Amino acid sequence: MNTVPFTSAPIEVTIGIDQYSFNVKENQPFHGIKDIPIGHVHVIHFQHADNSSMRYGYWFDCRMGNFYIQYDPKDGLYKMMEERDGAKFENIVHNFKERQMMVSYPKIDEDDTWYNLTEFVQMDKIRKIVRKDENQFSYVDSSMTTVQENELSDPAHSLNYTVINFKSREAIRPGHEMEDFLDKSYYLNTVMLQGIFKNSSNYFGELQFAFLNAMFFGNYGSSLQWHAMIELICSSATVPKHMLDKLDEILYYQIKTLPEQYSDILLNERVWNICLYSSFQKNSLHNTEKIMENKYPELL
Amino acid sequence: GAMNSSNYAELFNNDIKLFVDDTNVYRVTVHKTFEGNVATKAINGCIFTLNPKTGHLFLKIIHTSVWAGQKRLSQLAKWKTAEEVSALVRSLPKEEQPKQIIVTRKAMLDPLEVHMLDFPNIAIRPTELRLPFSAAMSIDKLSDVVMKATEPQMVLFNIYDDWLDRISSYTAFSRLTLLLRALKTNEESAKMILLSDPTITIKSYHLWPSFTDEQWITIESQMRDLILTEYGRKYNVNISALTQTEIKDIIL
Numbered sequence A: 001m002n003t004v005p006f007t008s009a010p011i012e013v014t015i016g017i018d019q020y021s022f023n024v025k026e027n028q029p030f031h032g033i034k035d036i037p038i039g040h041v042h043v044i045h046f047q048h049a050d051n052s053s054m055r056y057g058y059w060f061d062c063r064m065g066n067f068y069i070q071y072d073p074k075d076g077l078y079k080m081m082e083e084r085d086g087a088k089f090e091n092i093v094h095n096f097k098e099r100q101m102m103v104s105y106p107k108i109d110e111d112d113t114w115y116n117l118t119e120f121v122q123m124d125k126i127r128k129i130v131r132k133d134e135n136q137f138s139y140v141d142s143s144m145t146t147v148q149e150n151e152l153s154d155p156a157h158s159l160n161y162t163v164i165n166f167k168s169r170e171a172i173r174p175g176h177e178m179e180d181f182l183d184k185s186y187y188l189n190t191v192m193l194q195g196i197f198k199n200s201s202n203y204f205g206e207l208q209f210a211f212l213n214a215m216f217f218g219n220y221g222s223s224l225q226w227h228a229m230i231e232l233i234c235s236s237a238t239v240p241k242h243m244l245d246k247l248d249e250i251l252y253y254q255i256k257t258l259p260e261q262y263s264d265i266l267l268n269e270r271v272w273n274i275c276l277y278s279s280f281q282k283n284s285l286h287n288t289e290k291i292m293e294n295k296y297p298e299l300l
Numbered sequence B: 001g002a003m004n005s006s007n008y009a010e011l012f013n014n015d016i017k018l019f020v021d022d023t024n025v026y027r028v029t030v031h032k033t034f035e036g037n038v039a040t041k042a043i044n045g046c047i048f049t050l051n052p053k054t055g056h057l058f059l060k061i062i063h064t065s066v067w068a069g070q071k072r073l074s075q076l077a078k079w080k081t082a083e084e085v086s087a088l089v090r091s092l093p094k095e096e097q098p099k100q101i102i103v104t105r106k107a108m109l110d111p112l113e114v115h116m117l118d119f120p121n122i123a124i125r126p127t128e129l130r131l132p133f134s135a136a137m138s139i140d141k142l143s144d145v146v147m148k149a150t151e152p153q154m155v156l157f158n159i160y161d162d163w164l165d166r167i168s169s170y171t172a173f174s175r176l177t178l179l180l181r182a183l184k185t186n187e188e189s190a191k192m193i194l195l196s197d198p199t200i201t202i203k204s205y206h207l208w209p210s211f212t213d214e215q216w217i218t219i220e221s222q223m224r225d226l227i228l229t230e231y232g233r234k235y236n237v238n239i240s241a242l243t244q245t246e247i248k249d250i251i252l
């Protein structure tokens, strides 16, 4: 189990770690998060109490380095940094643990939620969507735009999700216009899976990462990407059976975890009604359809 | 975006543009089968692709063989229309290609956009105008060439005959849409109006009769009366009561 120490907490802030969150008061003696499960990516995120503008946070994997948080009073945010001195870091953590100044990652043993949300999410793939190669961790916030959003303006601060556009020459073979537009299997299987993602695991990883950025940061372009990747599968008549079953599991846990009160902004009525009730896969998402109908029957 | 009464004069400006109407592409007669079920029989159709400024009509005749062994024909018809309009654009020299294509039915937007991906600078637009182009098959010479077709065929017409020698394109278009609206509302009476007088003929190379300027005013007045008359028969309204302002809103 790994640890992300904090130098201090000089400003009042709600701190998230994965799907958990807790409030820290201004100048409270908080010095970090311990007992972080090894084996998953994680996200540590922030919303300041005095300016809920800009939720922001950091994706990281404790296997890739020793990371800590320190407030920067010039840039006005909690920054993640890497500590290269291993014995300094161990000594800092030990002292803070001895004084019990850390919150414990509060995982119930029965609980597979975080695994189920990050099953296909890899740090190496995150770092290609979020380009800042001098760090092993990746910053995301509420306002960052996607490459596609920018084509329709600072390229270094963009979310380089894979561009999906149903009315594009990439999606539509010359001479197969009607076929490819009404059945997106070509675009899904040849262009995206075989061509760009190489396999369904990478596709699902990007899908899951897009959902998590939408949920945790209210990142609108991430929400667009999550829905586009769902719609591309649902609108394909030919999808490997293992992908459909896995998608049903992925979406089920996403819908299960979504705050009930954020459904209006995080869920696109058109996409979900189309995917669950009109699409080729309308009958392939049993778990997802059942939780959506019991939890968000208004949307449908 | 969409084309309406606010931007109506844009139809007669110098940017090459075409209307596309797909109403008459997929045409059927519905009939009973020997077993007492219902079946359709397709008949030849056409795409109505019109330049509003010049009157040039690209009439692509849709022969019933294009439907053979196909499913979901009303859906296919939209994509076939889009395919044929795209092929027409590609067949035109660059200086003749449209800058805009206006579809009369919004269901044509996605099929045509997808077929025109190679032409990102050609705007595909809907219209809020209710245009009577479905009545094209009430023009005898157009109906004749469509029904007689034994294979796919493109036939070129000027739907304004020689009117542009004497009137603007705005006035020609207004005269065309009033003729077509009348033919659409009461075909029999409209054709009666257009041919009642045997001394006025249709030139071999024209679609409509050779009316003088004054005869056109009489004809256009008779067409407005027909559309008014039918409007009254429809809703059970005493049209005699109606004022001139009241008549102006109804005619379109």
Ligand SMILES: COC(=O)CSc1nnc(N)s1
Binding pocket: B011, B013, B014, B015, B016, B017, B018, B051, B052, B053, B054
């Ligand atoms: C007789 O040819 C021209 O006037 C070319 S300019 C133009 N044609 N069509 C339009 N809609 S604008």
Ligand SMILES: COC(=O)CSc1nnc(N)s1
Binding pocket: B171, B172, B173, B174, B175, B176, B177, B178, B181, B220, B251, B252
């Ligand atoms: C009913 O819609 C119209 O545009 C009628 S006005 C008109 N027709 N013919 C002319 N010469 S002016």
